[PDB]
Amino acid sequence: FEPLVREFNDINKIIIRQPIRTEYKIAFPYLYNNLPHHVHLTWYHT
């Protein structure tokens, strides 16, 4: 789609153990992003 909007995160202070896989931003939207505006919740398991 098109963009809807258009000393803390130091790279020497963050353990990159597993690469942040992009689908985490869908599966858990608040925890993996800053500013989640107009976000929708997901039904996740039946």
Partner: protein, 195 residues
């Protein structure tokens, strides 16, 4: 877990605090341990050279630590019954069974504190005056954390010589508490720290 903190961040943003929040990648909390007996032991005193503490570190076993975490090895009963439980469960020594002082960072922790200096611990009235200060330094330093202020799991601290001067009455406890803290640091750090 993941969904718990996702839900509380949703709750934090939408229900109470509408402010945009920078949030880093989540890291776990860590702990510390020791796997072997201590080296040539350290004895350290106060800035005024009055009172010393001689302490080694050797690990209490897996069963010991997990059972103190299950409260069954609590010292709130008689010292004799606690010693009998140490005997009937771990082949523990009788002379070390009636000498254990405290536990560690909380009411039931993963550490233990033993005294065995049988020629030199006849000085009991002068040892028990600072025994509670050794406990007040011990619990506090075990909930502090030497390396990166985490907790200390499964380490035994054992005192082998008590050199405390005659009638301190103001110096003793207040100076021995950071001294007990520092000798805890030395006996932990000296021979085998692990994460």
């Amino acid at each position: 877990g993941e969904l718990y903190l996702d839900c509380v961040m949703h709750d934090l943003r939408k229900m109470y605090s509408e402010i945009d929040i920078k949030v880093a990648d989540p890291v776990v909390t860590f702990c510390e341990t020791v796997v072997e007996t201590s080296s040539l032991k350290c004895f350290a005193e106060t800035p005024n050279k009055k009172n010393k503490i001689t302490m080694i570190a050797e690990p209490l076993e897996k069963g010991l630590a997990e059972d103190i975490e299950n409260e069954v090895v609590q010292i709130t009963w008689n010292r004799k019954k606690l010693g009998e439980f140490f005997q009937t469960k771990y082949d523990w020594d009788l002379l070390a069974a009636r000498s254990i002082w405290a536990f560690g960072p909380d009411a039931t922790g993963p550490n233990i504190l033993v005294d065995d200096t049988l020629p030199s611990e006849v000085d009991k009235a002068l040892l028990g005056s600072v025994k509670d200060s050794i406990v007040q330094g011990f619990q506090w330093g075990t909930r502090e954390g030497p390396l990166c202020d985490e907790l200390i799991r499964n380490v035994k601290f054992k005192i082998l010589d008590a050199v405390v001067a005659q009638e301190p009455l103001h110096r003793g406890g207040g100076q021995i508490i950071p001294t007990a803290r520092r000798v805890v640091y030395s006996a932990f750090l000296m021979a085998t720290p692990r994460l």
